[PDB]
Amino acid sequence: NRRNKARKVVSRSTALVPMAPASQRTGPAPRKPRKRNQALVRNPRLTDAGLAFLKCAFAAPDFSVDPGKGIPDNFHGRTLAIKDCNTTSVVFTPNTDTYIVVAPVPGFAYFRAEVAVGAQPTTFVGVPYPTYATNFGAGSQNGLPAVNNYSKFRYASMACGLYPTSNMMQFSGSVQVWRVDLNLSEAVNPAVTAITPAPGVFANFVDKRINGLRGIRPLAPRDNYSGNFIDGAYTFAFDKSTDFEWCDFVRSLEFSESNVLGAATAMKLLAPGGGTDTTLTGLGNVNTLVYKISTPTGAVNTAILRTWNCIELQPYTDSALFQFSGVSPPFDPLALECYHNLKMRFPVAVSSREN
Amino acid sequence: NPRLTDAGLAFLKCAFAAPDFSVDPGKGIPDNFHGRTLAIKDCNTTSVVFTPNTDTYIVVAPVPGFAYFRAEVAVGAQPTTFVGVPYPTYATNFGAGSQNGLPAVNNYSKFRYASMACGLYPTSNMMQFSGSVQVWRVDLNLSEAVNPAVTAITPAPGVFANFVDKRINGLRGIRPLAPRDNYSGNFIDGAYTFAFDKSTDFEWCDFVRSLEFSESNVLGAATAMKLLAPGGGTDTTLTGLGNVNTLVYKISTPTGAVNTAILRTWNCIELQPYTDSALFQFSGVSPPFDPLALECYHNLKMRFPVAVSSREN
């Protein structure tokens, strides 16, 4: 019959066990449940930007001008939205398995690796967008805070399309696509704190790694697309964080399974030219697209490779790019919900040359 | 307006009433992730004995692969090193050998805890038990400290630069004198409770493979409080720290008493899998969005006792 009384918690045998003290608390308890009269009603309306957000996400190549404007969530802030696509011509080396890996590393169109047909790829070298310097800086300092033009990023969309350009007799082989959930990770290891007294003083510091690469192999996983090279292939990547999580920059020459530079056996994403001009910037919130082309001996396999990406970035207020910054899309919960719902309802990939 | 979806209901059952059904109902977090996951639904049930004349701390922290961390200390003394006890499934999930836990052998690239609970079930008789079980939750979170390290050994004393080292905040709260909120019952009454989301919204976590999660960046520091992988991390190392709070169980045993019990540690983990593991064949799409279930979960978590007698499950 009392109010603020302490709560007792049942003793096994009330005769064989001494009584324990009733439980108390710090701070007031949670308020009594809210009444059902506090009815907050919602109008299911898709906003214009929310619709554009959806087009940019899934149907990247279907419009006159890239519709993307950013993610229509509660961020509602000052951003710079990159809506771009790297369209280039490529050739696949006869008698090889080529891997075109499209990962969310700002500034890079994709990562390539060539290997003996049937063999296991290890190092994928990045091919940057010509805009890299403009966005993240040039020179030895490229990618660092001093020359970077952004302080945070998140991917609103990313897609890839392979458009065969060989005739029906000169080519041969296959295209296979699947997605891997590439995520950065860390390992704590010792490093020298003082060189005296030998063998020196140590402490444990953190080094960066990347999980998921092992999934890039000749044997395609359950969820994949497999087809005749000449039919090409297209697909989109989608959010693997839960809410289009914002990402911080992590400038590195490589994202590998090992913290040892150039470790031959370690699978890794590697910036080209020793990172002299373009280094790895970080890893985004969407999953990674994997394209595997198998070109037999004598086969002439050529194609145009298109890599799309829409990135929302928090800009430095001093770049020449700042003049294009504005406020991001207004909150559209319906659009967001649609996105997360839709992302799971399409084939892992589709032929590009049939559309 | 609506009501709970099937998965949303299961989510709630798994979260709070882990030991109450025929088969673990858990399926994952019913939010908007709606993606490819491998969901671990497991419980480490083992027999234990508490050393007479010692304060034993059973810390149930969200470190994938580990059932709990144990520390034995003189009654009244300050515990400092809690050694992990791994699930037998560790190797299967995170790899074996010297490389255990690393990207090369790990089968996942991301994780988030959908639930975690612990239950202590006394097995002593009415003439041999003696002592108590004190339970309370602590918010363990990884943290960082920027410190200098040698960049070049020439010219002596060398060239330096500041690098980050990992640490963990919260451990200091694990001590003999518990907070007023603590549940303090007799050992013979056992204890049961669940942990809950302390992240913004069931945030996803990246792996951070380490031998220890301590207050200091110096290995083996005697005075540093720490979570420590057993056997020098030879086979099992710390994988990272989850989004839920940590459960603390302090069991006090006097000389002459025989306090034994079965210890159950539950946990439901959603993980983004490597597409090549032999486990991938079990991956599928996570539960469909159920906003009601989510609101309920976050509402209810703060509404139950810190812990209850184990014979109240």
């Binding site: 919602r42 959806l54 149907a59 419009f63 919960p333 967001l336 839709l342 309802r345 589709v350 | 906003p291």
Partner: peptide, 25 residues
């Protein structure tokens, strides 16, 4: 616009206001 057409199609198979619960927060 074949891919978008497909998106629109699916977009309708889930338009109920399983189905979309307008209550996204």
């Amino acid at each position: 616009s074949k891919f978008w057409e497909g998106v629109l199609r699916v977009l309708n198979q889930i338009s109920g206001t399983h189905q979309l619960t307008g209550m996204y927060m």
